[PDB]
Amino acid sequence: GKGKPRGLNSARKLRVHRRNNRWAENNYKKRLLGTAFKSSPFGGSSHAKGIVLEKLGIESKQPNSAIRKCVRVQLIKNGKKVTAFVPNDGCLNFVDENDEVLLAGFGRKGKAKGDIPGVRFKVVKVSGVSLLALWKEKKEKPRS
Amino acid sequence: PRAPRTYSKTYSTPKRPYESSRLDAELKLAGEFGLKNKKEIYRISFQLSKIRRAARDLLTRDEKDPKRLFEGNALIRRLVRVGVLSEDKKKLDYVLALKVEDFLERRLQTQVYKLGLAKSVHHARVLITQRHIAVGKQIVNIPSFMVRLDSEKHIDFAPTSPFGGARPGRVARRNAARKAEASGE
Amino acid sequence: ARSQGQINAARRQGLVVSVDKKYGSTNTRGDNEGQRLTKVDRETDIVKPKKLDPNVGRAISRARTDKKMSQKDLATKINEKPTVVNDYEAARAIPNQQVLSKLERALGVKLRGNNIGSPL
Amino acid sequence: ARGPKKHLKRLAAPHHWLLDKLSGCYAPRPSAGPHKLRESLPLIVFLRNRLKYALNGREVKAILMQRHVKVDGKVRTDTTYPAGFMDVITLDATNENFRLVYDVKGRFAVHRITDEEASYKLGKVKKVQLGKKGVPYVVTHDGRTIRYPDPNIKVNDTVKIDLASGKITDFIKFDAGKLVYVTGGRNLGRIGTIVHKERHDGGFDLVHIKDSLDNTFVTRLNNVFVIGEQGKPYISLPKGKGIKLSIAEERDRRRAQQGL
Amino acid sequence: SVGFGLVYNSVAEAKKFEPTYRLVRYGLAEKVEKASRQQRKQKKNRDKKIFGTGKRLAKKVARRNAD
RNA sequence: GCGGUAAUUCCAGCUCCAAUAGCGUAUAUUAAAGUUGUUGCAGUUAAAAAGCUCGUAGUUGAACUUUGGGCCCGGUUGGCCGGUCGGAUUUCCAACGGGGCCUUUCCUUCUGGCUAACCUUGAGUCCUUGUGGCUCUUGGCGAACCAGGACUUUUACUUUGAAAAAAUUAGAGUGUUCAAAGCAGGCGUAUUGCUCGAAUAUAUUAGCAUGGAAUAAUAGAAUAGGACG
RNA sequence: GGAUAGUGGCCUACCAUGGUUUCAACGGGUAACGGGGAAUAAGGGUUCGAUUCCGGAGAGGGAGCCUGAGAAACGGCUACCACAUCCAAGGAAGGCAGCAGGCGCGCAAAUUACCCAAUCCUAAUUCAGGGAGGUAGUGACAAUAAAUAACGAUACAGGGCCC
Secondary structure, eight states: OOSSOOOTTTHHHHHHHHHHHGGGSTTHHHHHTTOTTTTSSSSSOSEEEEEEEEEEOOBOOTTOOOBOOEEEEEESSSOOEEEEEOOSTTTTTTOOTTOOEEEEOOSSSSSOOTTSOSOOOEEEEESSSOSHHHHTTSOOOOOO | OOOOOOOOOOOOOOSSSOOHHHHHHHHHHHHHHTOOSHHHHHHHHHHHHHHHHHHHHHHTSOTTOHHHHHHHHHHHHHHHHHTSSOTTOOSTTGGGGOOHHHHHTTOHHHHHHHHSSSSSHHHHHHHHHTTOOEETTEEOOOSOOOOOSGGGTTEEOOSSSGGGSSSOOHHHHHHHHHHIIIIIO | OHHHHHHHHHSSSOOSOOOSOOOOTTOTTTTSHHHHHHHHHHHOSOOOOOOOOHHHHHHHHHHHHHTTOOHHHHHHHHTSOHHHHHHHHHTOOOOOHHHHHHHHHHHOOOEETTEESOOO | OOSOOOOOBTTSSOGGGOOOSOSOSBOOOOOSOSSOTTTOEEHHHHHHHTTOSOSSHHHHHHHHHTTOOEETTEEOOOTTOEEOTTOOOBOSSSOOEEOOOOOSSSOOOOOEEOSTTSSOEEEEOOOEEEOGGGOEEEOOSSOOOEESOOTTOOTTOEEEEOSSOOOOOSEEOOOSSOEEEEOSTTSTTEEEEEEEEEOOTTSOOEEEEEOTTSOEEEEESSSOOEEEETTEESSOOOTTOSOOOOHHHHHHHHHHHSOO | OOOOOOOOSSHHHHHHHSOHHHHHHTTSSOOOOOOOHHHHHHHHHHHHHSOSOSHHHHHHHHHHHHO
16 A cells, blocks of 8 residues: 555656655755746845845835835846845935945845845845944944 | 865754753853863763764674774773773773763863862862963863873972972062062162 | 862852752842741731831932932932832832842942941 | 876875875875886885985985995886885895885885895796797786796796896796785785685686685785795795784784783 | 984085085075075076077177167 | 833843854755655645546566484474373483584586595514504595586575775874874883884675575476487 | 778768667756765765866867877967957067966955975986975964963841741
């Protein structure tokens, strides 16, 4: 019984059956078609330098209400316009137009966080510093 | 290109990092024997795990084959010469019952305190790292020396090191010249 | 255990053994607890909960008024509430040795029975 | 890749040279010579790892250039000279005579002999063949070809050849029950007898070896090398006498001999 | 302390076999004043550029640079 | 999930916790993951038995063909052993196969090469009276080993051996002052030198020699064109 | 038969239609150099290996060829294509995926340093030369050894329980 062919010669049947049931794992097809180097906004990178176009009011999901103060950036290498979160308090006002910020992933591989809807990314630096340092006032920004 | 100098890490971090039991037990270890960072404890338990790994997978071999005989008697020889293993426990089962503090007992950190010399484990620590401790004729400044059998005889001070006579040092000298100028003339 | 006995007696107060885990790491309220609450439960009687004299409270009033602050400023100085500070002035309060220790470490005023009013 | 390697890095030389991993990239890369670069050892690692008569390649070059080192009797100034199996590296200065014979472990060690037996090296023959003007000739494993043999010699027979005469002396006809010196694989450097001999015609014929201490093994036949008669070898042998103790009794001999 | 030492018979043969930097360490040879290696390779390049004997060229280029 | 008026989650301070000359972050593979499952999943209803049969590949497939050694042991029939009023046993004891131990352990055979040792005698010498004792073969003994043959069903399987570059890895020796490391070093009689070392394991399918003949297929001799001679 | 170093459809004439494949051929992808190995590890495994060693392959793209034992060599030449330099505007020489260095590209990665002394190599050769290689600087990639204080002397408080 049990389904599988338990035969002492049945290994090609066994291995083909395994190889073709692997794709239903979310990650085997995701590497092996090549989907990061095809159509995720980054090319397998973790951070990308981008250019600020817009400041966006993304309003949070259902058990919350807040306007989240995100930013709408464009990549350098690839041209994608993409939302990005500007993290902790008051650091929207540290960013103006076209500020060449640095984008990271967000904590769940490439899905959203909590109650910003649809966003994948975040900013960590603006034009070559940081945001932690700027927020704790331990670094002052150069002026271009 | 000259070959890579091979190197390795010397410990394993624990797998569930916030367990109250592991915290309090390792805290009694560290605050008992004056251990600086838990890199020390995890290195000790790593050495214990390596010998425990070889002991399990060597004990699985049959009696009277020269691999088990050879590596077994040499392993017990090493533990005897370090001193964590008793003189009559020499069997491949008693080696796996070792706890961590049995390996902490043979640290020269502890051996200075056990032989006297300090009035504290912590004073032993500051004395070893300020280099007044010479095993025979070699100074150490390593608290985690993992001391051996015969040289526990030879734990004492140095031919330098003002505790071991021979030209007292800095603050004593400055106070000597200070009292000489302030009270002599 | 003779050698560490001498070591821990050479350190602060300790006991004849000192290896057992005291508990509640930021429960800073365990000054008065472990002997008195297990008295008042076991009593099955009525006990007298009393604060000492309002001279301590007027010492607080004099020291605060001399240091040019208010009650609320003193509460946000000692990380407690205005109500507990205000009752500690006006003598309708109950004691807490821990809070009295913060009042002394912020003011430098003896709040201790016989002697009142100097940073020791 | 366009032609012959002249470099050879460390971690690629044989292990019987026992070179440290560091203090260079490179390893002293034998020239062409009589003996293969797996089975030979250059004079530079011989002199500075195994005899300690120099610390520098500068020094080894001057030492050889002073024309004392008569490797098989002839003065050699070449640092990259592949000194290999059964080699009679002699001097005049220290008046010593080294013969490259192995260890029990498989390592070209030191074997200090007298002037007698510094005047003959042995050699396995590896093809005997007929050449110009009807002249037969016989090969060795340093490549010493010799014309006009004893026709009693066949292949896989060994020969005692002196230093300078050539002039084939006492050979040994190969058969069963003879002392041989197995010089390859894991049986490299052990000594035994020719208890049995087998022909797997077409590929890699073999020979059973029994040593003195009752340890049968079975070697291939390009690793065999006849050293002579039963209890009578034509040269001298190192410590251990090619016997390969077990590791536990090896440790036991080391520990017992350690101290008085 | 541990170092490694050499003693010699026949000091002439000693300085024969001796590394010359140690001879400079011992005052037995002059600390050689040679050019920096960049300067030496550059002069070497000029040397391999000038074919001939050099002054055969210097004469005619001085002749032509005169007028 | 907190945050919509007294926020144990925001911003600060106070205090603490942990890792500590390091801590956090992003992303990716690994463990967690018996959530890829051969070991090792699940399909009535949670996702999931093709509508149903046929059927080529693949995968799988009932039963059956005898066993050279002995020492010890126990188990069954049994006989001289029958005492007990047809059962009642011990063991001097065969074997009936069975469990360990050292080995019988082998390749089946000619073509003779060649015989180790003879059934001995070719007679008596050395020496205790002499089958003590050799120098020796004319009537015997081939496997102790060689190569021209024929034994020849082929494998899949498993045991053993040689290969399984150096580093790596597991690990043996060693106080690099501990150590990460390295392949060193250690002892004197330190004044004209002695010496151990630098192992071993592992690596796989694929080959290549080797034993094992259970398992699993495969050839025979039927319309005897059979082997024996 | 020629070619070749030499076998060979390697090529040519002639003569046959063969050879492979559902036990996956042929064609497509790849963020494919391979192997030694690395990580994680109960066991069975899964992913990775541009990279300190072996084997390969390439010198901007592509072919051809002298020299030579050995190169389809590019720190050699010739041709084209792509890219760019200096001129007196006639022309000439080009190759960093050697070593540093610069630009661009990027989340993204060092001195236009000293030297044959080590380890190796080359030659007519102990000697000359070696941006092979070694030596410092940058360097929180990693990995180890592990300073930030030790020994005292001190005091004030509560609050249980015996009185």
